[PDB]
Amino acid sequence: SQNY
């Protein structure tokens, strides 16, 4: 997951 995640994404910045």
Place this chain on the structure above:
Amino acid sequence: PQVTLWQRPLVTIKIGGQLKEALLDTGADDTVLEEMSLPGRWKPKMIGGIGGFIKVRQYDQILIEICGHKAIGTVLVGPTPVNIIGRNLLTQIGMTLNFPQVTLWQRPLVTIKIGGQLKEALLDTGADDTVLEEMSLPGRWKPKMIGGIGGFIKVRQYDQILIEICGHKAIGTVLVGPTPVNIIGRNLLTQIGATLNF
């Protein structure tokens, strides 16, 4: 130093007398750090991102050392899942994106073509994946959740998708969902030979 994006662009930073690791994030307008002890006063503030919004404490005029390079600016401290160095500080250390060199005084936007449609997207070194706002895409997809600064969002995952980023072709996974902005992550950035230089 030049850095490729096959791995997360992590750097060592010193702030408030403490050493930490942070992600060089071209997709971030500002710098947000996990909870930590910082001197002086701050101001309440809310910032957005994928997942939603989070409340942070805004510290201005803070001295920060990013891999040896000194910079002074605003740092936000809050419930962020990863420490990220945003453009407000990346510009201070002469950070540029190369793939066609690009400074970071402005959001590094690009024109992309996917699913036969033209769109604008943000080159995001802080994102592992590529996430696009709801759109019509051909083929089958699989349910998937991804996290971000404000939490998590449900997205549709499409594999083997052909995408053109500023004329450069790449094929990879594209996630479609409730993202506040279209972001091109490292899975695709590596294919267009993107590098960070500072």
